[PDB]
Amino acid sequence: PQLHNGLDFSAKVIQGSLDSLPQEVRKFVEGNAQLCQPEYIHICDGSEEEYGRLLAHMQEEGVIRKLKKYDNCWLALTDPRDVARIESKTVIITQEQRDTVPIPKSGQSQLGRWMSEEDFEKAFNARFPGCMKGRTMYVIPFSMGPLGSPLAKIGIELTDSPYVVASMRIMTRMGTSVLEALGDGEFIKCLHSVGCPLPLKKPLVNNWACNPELTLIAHLPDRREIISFGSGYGGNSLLGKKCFALRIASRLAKEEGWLAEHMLILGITNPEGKKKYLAAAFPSACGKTNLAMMNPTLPGWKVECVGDDIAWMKFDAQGNLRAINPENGFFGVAPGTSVKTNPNAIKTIQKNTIFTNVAETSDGGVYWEGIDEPLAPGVTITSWKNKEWRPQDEEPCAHPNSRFCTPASQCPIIDPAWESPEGVPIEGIIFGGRRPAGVPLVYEALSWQHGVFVGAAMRSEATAAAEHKGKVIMHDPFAMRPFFGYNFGKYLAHWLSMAHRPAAKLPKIFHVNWFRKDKNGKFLWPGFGENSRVLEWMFGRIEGEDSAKLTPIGYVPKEDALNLKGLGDVNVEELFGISKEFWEKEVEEIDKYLEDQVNADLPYEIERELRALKQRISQM
Ligand SMILES: Nc1nc2c(ncn2[C@@H]2O[C@H](COP(=O)(O)OP(=O)(O)OP(=O)(O)O)[C@@H](O)[C@H]2O)c(=O)[nH]1
Numbered sequence: 001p002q003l004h005n006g007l008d009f010s011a012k013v014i015q016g017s018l019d020s021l022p023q024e025v026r027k028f029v030e031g032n033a034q035l036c037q038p039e040y041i042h043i044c045d046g047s048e049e050e051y052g053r054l055l056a057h058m059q060e061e062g063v064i065r066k067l068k069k070y071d072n073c074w075l076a077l078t079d080p081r082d083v084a085r086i087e088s089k090t091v092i093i094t095q096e097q098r099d100t101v102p103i104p105k106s107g108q109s110q111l112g113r114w115m116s117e118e119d120f121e122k123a124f125n126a127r128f129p130g131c132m133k134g135r136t137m138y139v140i141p142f143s144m145g146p147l148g149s150p151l152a153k154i155g156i157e158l159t160d161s162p163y164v165v166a167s168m169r170i171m172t173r174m175g176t177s178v179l180e181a182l183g184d185g186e187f188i189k190c191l192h193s194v195g196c197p198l199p200l201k202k203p204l205v206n207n208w209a210c211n212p213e214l215t216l217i218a219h220l221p222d223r224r225e226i227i228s229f230g231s232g233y234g235g236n237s238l239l240g241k242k243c244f245a246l247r248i249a250s251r252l253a254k255e256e257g258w259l260a261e262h263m264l265i266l267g268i269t270n271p272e273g274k275k276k277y278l279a280a281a282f283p284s285a286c287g288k289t290n291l292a293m294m295n296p297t298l299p300g301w302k303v304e305c306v307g308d309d310i311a312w313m314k315f316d317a318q319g320n321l322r323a324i325n326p327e328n329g330f331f332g333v334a335p336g337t338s339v340k341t342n343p344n345a346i347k348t349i350q351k352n353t354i355f356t357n358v359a360e361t362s363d364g365g366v367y368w369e370g371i372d373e374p375l376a377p378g379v380t381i382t383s384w385k386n387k388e389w390r391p392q393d394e395e396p397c398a399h400p401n402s403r404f405c406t407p408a409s410q411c412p413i414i415d416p417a418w419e420s421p422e423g424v425p426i427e428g429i430i431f432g433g434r435r436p437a438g439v440p441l442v443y444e445a446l447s448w449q450h451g452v453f454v455g456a457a458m459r460s461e462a463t464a465a466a467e468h469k470g471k472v473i474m475h476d477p478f479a480m481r482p483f484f485g486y487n488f489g490k491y492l493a494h495w496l497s498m499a500h501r502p503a504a505k506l507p508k509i510f511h512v513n514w515f516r517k518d519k520n521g522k523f524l525w526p527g528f529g530e531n532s533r534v535l536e537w538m539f540g541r542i543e544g545e546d547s548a549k550l551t552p553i554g555y556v557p558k559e560d561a562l563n564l565k566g567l568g569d570v571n572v573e574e575l576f577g578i579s580k581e582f583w584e585k586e587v588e589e590i591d592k593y594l595e596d597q598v599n600a601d602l603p604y605e606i607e608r609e610l611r612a613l614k615q616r617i618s619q620m
């Protein structure tokens with residue numbers, strides 16, 4: 001078959017067999033093995049023995065530390081230059097720029113970053129040749145969604161990072177069973193490399209292999225390929241999460257007629273024994289995980305978690321909107337997680353959990369800002385910078401974007417249908433972000449078209465999940481600005497087209513704001529478990545209760561319609577105040593934004609909602 005058998009990497013396989021791979025899987029592995037030149041090839045089987053041996057190797061290489069206070073928990077400290085997503089180095093490659101991003105009017109699009117195929121080939125050939133020299137190439141077969149489910153998509157990731165392999169075992173369904181379900185079927189090609197071939201040219205920091213200078217995360221939807229280079233952080237290296245399940249999946253969803261969204265899925269049950277499922281799209285570090293597994297304060301209410309970050313939704317033959325969580329774990333923000341803000345997350349991360357860039361205590365535990373737990377006498381803290389850290393210092397002991405990686409099955413309130421292949425019926429959709437002023441606590445959209453407009457007009461404060469710093473209010477429509485896989489105008493038209501489906505049970509659409517502050521800078525709403533009071537009103541509105549009052553921005557709860565028992569100290573006037581002067585500026589910014597960023601691809605119905613809202617505000 002060959003003149004020198006130079007394309008036969010079978011001699012470098014330390015686990016598995018190239019003869020046991022499907023045809024297109026073997027070509028994908030051997031092809032990039034020839035390009036990246038790894039010393040070994042490791043075909044993952046997903047077993048606990050492999051996971052155990054993998055952790056031991058990382059512990060011997062100094063990559064991770066063991067947390068002896070907990071059961072099978074591990075800490076990783078990364079290079080300070082590789083701590084979050086880099087939107088400016090995240091690109092999408094299509095033949096036409098207009099397929100990826102709308103051509104702006106004034107210029108420079110904020111709805112994505114497009115790179116031509118010619119430029120990407122130059123960038124690709126300047127990075128990957130010989131990039132895995134002296135390292136092991138791990139072959140990761142993983143399924144997004146329940147295995148064997150016809151509504152699940154299978155991926156193959158190639159990486160030279162054992163930290164990525166362990167995290168993908170938690171975040172996805174990984175192992176040999178995925179290759180058997182795959183067969184000769186298609187798969188998304190995922191190629192990742194830390195970009196530090198051996199011997200090292202540059203000195204390594206915190207044993208974290210990364211190349212910040214050449215960092216690039218590329219998406220090729222026409223070729224169904226994800227190519228990421230130079231970063232170890234989960235958002236850039238766990239390719240089945242943001243890269244596949246959002247960016248690549250959103251384009252596939254548009255083509256096939258479903259939805260891939262940056263949304264949590266929760267099930268809520270009332271004291272009358274009636275349960276409904278809701279979805280909520282909040283921007284990064286805006287409260288999805290806390291809401292998806294909150295501890296309700298109202299007696300007789302129970303909330304169960306289906307997912308906390310990614311939802312795949314599709315209308316069924318009965319007209320219901322069915323959603324699944326394609327993930328297998330929680331990659332949640334660590335700081336702020338305490339027993340009072342998220343006790344269900346505390347119970348989950350007790351075991352089998354990988355932490356990244358959180359502080360370690362001398363007794364083998366974890367620590368971060370907002371953990372709200374005093375330490376015993378004698379217990380010292382080592383910060384995420386691997387330095388002696390004291391409470392009276394300026395630098396935080398944990399990075400603001402530090403994460404835990406925990407299995408979703410360990411969550412105490414995990415929904416008993418979170419792995420159901422048919423999905424859960426969604427009866428409501430929630431938008432919202434961080435607005436310190438103007439936006440009331442909750443309101444309801446007037447129609448489906450107005451609801452789609454509400455998602456498109458979302459604005460929020462910047463967080464630590466990306467590279468955007470400061471307290472500046474940015475646009476983040478549908479909480480998908482960093483994750484749009486294709487033209488946002490076409491994305492809006494795809495959402496609007498759902499109203500044209502036969503017998504489609506369109507969910508109700510709400511908008512919330514947990515973060516409205518007073519004149520002194522403190523929150524008007526306590527939030528966290530108290531958000532069950534807001535969910536109670538949405539539940540009643542879905543049942544058709546006459547609890548709404550019409551406003552120029554939509555329906556708000558009537559007077560005494562919210563349950564405020566126990567919270568008599570809440571100022572309801574400023575919390576639901578709708579100022580005409582504030583909303584005249586708001587429609588001005590939304591108009592200038594949509595006209596510039598969406599331009600000729602703006603659906604008329606979204607334009608009509610903007611015009612109708614501006615008219616209702618002018619009549620105040
Ligand atoms: N004031 C207030 N802050 C909250 C509330 N819920 C969460 N937060 C804060 O917001 C931060 C973000 O929490 P998460 O739920 O992990 O954010 P997320 O929406 O899941 O973001 P990603 O996981 O990156 O997609 C937390 O550290 C909390 O401190 C709330 O109800 N009220």
Ligand SMILES: O=C([O-])C(=O)[O-]
Nearest residue numbers: 235283284285309465
């Ligand atoms: O990491 C995340 O989940 C994000 O950035 O939304």
Ligand SMILES: [Mn+2]
Nearest residue numbers: 262283284309
């Ligand atoms: Mn997210």
Ligand SMILES: [Mn+2]
Nearest residue numbers: 289308332333
């Ligand atoms: Mn989250």
Ligand SMILES: [Mn+2]
Nearest residue numbers: 496497499605
């Ligand atoms: Mn229409």
